[PDB]
Amino acid sequence: IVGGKVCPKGECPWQVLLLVNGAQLCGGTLINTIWVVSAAHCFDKIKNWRNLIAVLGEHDLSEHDGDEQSRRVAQVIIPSTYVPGTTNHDIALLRLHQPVVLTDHVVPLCLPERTFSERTLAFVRFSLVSGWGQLLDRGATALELMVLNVPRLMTQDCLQQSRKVGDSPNITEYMFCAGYSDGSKDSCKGDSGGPHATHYRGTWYLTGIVSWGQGCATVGHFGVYTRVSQYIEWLQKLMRSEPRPGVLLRAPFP
Amino acid sequence: ICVNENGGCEQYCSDHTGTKRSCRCHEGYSLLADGVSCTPTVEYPCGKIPILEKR
Ligand SMILES: COc1ccc(-c2ccc(C(=O)N[C@H](CO)C(C)(C)C)cc2C(=O)O)c(C(=O)Nc2cccc(C(N)=O)c2)n1
Ligand SMILES: [Ca+2]
């Protein structure tokens, strides 16, 4: 996260840290005691599927304070439409091997209904993005969880306000733009898969997943987030299904 | 009705035949007798921050 602040410990309790062989991979969002939402692209280069760990209640990576809860990732479910090495349909649903225990420091974010998300949440201007990602473009990652407030843009307005670069990926209906074009504030490498959380009438909801951008906080560019509302029905159906053998599962989308 | 200001619902809204609207809540919440508000039924409902709720 570039240009944000430290999320006070316990104020981002749905934040997930994903690890591979104990090393920082990506972020995620807890949506109930067993299920985590992350980005499909985080799994493009995984070979050691058995060494994938999700950590809940994490805050400071330098110390163990006892609020952390680690779980093996039993399954990673990706839409059939996602293509490795690309940006479209950038979502993954992760089943934990054992549920996390809900506490003051481990709480799920609400996965909203599709109509509520499209008709109401999509018009809430500011939302929070968080992670232990790079603090600067080509910079060091954070030891404490960071959070940033970002405004959402209509895709026409994002394309109008953005500088042309060439060979740049298109903004599809499965994405949205959020952030600032003045090079001060953005999500960054390592924040991928983390939450874009929206407040509405005293409750927080999952509206986006940190996905991509053309460098962190690049002047003339905004952050790109997976538009979660497109996937509500897809996620709900998978969560009502029995686990299948094998860590990686490709599920038909729609 | 649900299209305009979430039909007055705190959480989810369902449109019905005629001038009928039913508000609903996410799991871990119940609808109040006002028919719009949602109250937690569990200790750790989704989307609430305990350290902020407790103070
Ligand atoms: C879509 O596929 C992909 C595929 C791979 C990457 C990607 C490439 C490299 C790194 C990276 O350097 N990772 C590190 C370990 O190797 C570490 C986690 C930062 C310590 C991290 C990512 C990442 O997923 O965050 C990315 C990516 O960089 N996304 C992203 C997220 C947020 C902001 C920006 C940005 N504005 O540049 C980019 N996107
Ligand atoms: Ca820690």
Cβ atoms A24, A141 nearer than 8 A: yes
Cβ atoms A107, B48 nearer than 8 A: yes
Measured distance CA(A114)–CA(A254) in Å, rounded = 14
For residues A140 and A160, membership in a common domain is answered with yes
Q: Using the beta-carbon criterion (under 8 Å), do A203 and B48 form an inter-chain contact?
A: yes
For residues A116 and A103, membership in a common domain is answered with no
Cβ atoms A107, B49 nearer than 8 A: yes
Chain A residues in contact with B26 (beta carbon < 8 A): 110, 112, 203
Whether ligand 1 lies within 6 angstroms of the CB of A210 is answered as yes
For residues A2 and A128, membership in a common domain is answered with yes
Mutate to test the interface with A, among B44, B52, B54, B55 (most CBs of A within 10 A): B44
Q: What are phi and psi of A24, to 5 degrees?
A: -60, 125
- Considering the domain boundaries, does residue A248 fall inside one? no
Domain that holds residue A143: 1-12+109-229
Q: 3-class SS at A206?
A: strand
Measured distance CA(A59)–CA(B30) in Å, rounded = 31
From A116, which residue of chain B is nearest by alpha-carbon distance? B12
A117 among known catalytic residues: no
Beta strands in chain A (DSSP E): 5-6, 15-20, 23-30, 35-38, 52-56, 69-79, 92-96, 126-131, 146-153, 175-178, 195-200, 203-212, 223-227, 248-251
For residues A36 and A127, membership in a common domain is answered with no
- Please identify, by atom number, the ligand 1 atom nearest to the C-alpha of residue A134: 19
Q: Does A186 show up as a binding residue in the annotation?
A: yes
A236 interfacial to chain B (CB closer than 8 Å): no
Q: 3-class SS at A93?
A: strand
Catalytic option among A59, A89, A90, A105 = A90
For residues A202 and A121, membership in a common domain is answered with yes
For residues A91 and A118, membership in a common domain is answered with no
Q: How far is CA A197 from CA A125, A191, B42, in A?
A: 11, 14, 21
Measured distance CA(A243)–CA(A100) in Å, rounded = 17
Burial per residue of A221-230, b for 16 or more beta-carbon CB atoms within 10 angstroms, e otherwise? bbbbbbbbbb
CATH code, A177: 2.40.10.10
Cβ atoms A228, A173 nearer than 8 A: no
CATH number given to B1-55: 2.10.25.10
Q: What are phi and psi of A3, to 5 degrees?
A: 70, 25
- Considering the domain boundaries, does residue A57 fall inside one? yes
Domain ranges of chain B: 1-55
B34 interfacial to chain A (CB closer than 8 Å): no
- Considering the domain boundaries, does residue A254 fall inside one? no
For residues A221 and A235, membership in a common domain is answered with no
For residues A130 and A178, membership in a common domain is answered with yes
For residues A76 and A144, membership in a common domain is answered with no
A41 among known catalytic residues: yes
The 10 Å Cβ neighbour count of residue A100 is: 22
Q: What are phi and psi of B32, to 5 degrees?
A: -75, 170
Task: Please tell me whether the peptide bond between A254 and the residue prior to it is cis, using omega within 30 degrees of 0.
Answer: yes
- Considering the domain boundaries, does residue A252 fall inside one? no
Single-letter amino acid, residue A215: G
How many structural domains comprise chain A?
2
The 10 Å Cβ neighbour count of residue A114 is: 14
Q: How far is CA A232 from CA A57, A65, A110, A204, A251, in A?
A: 25, 35, 11, 16, 14
Please tell me the experimental approach by which this structure was elucidated: X-ray
Cβ atoms A233, A60 nearer than 8 A: no
Single-letter amino acid, residue A94: L
Count the residues in chain B.
55
- Considering the domain boundaries, does residue A249 fall inside one? no
Measured distance CA(A200)–CA(A8) in Å, rounded = 21
Burial per residue of A136-161, b for 16 or more beta-carbon CB atoms within 10 angstroms, e otherwise? eeeeebbeebbbbebebbeeeebeee
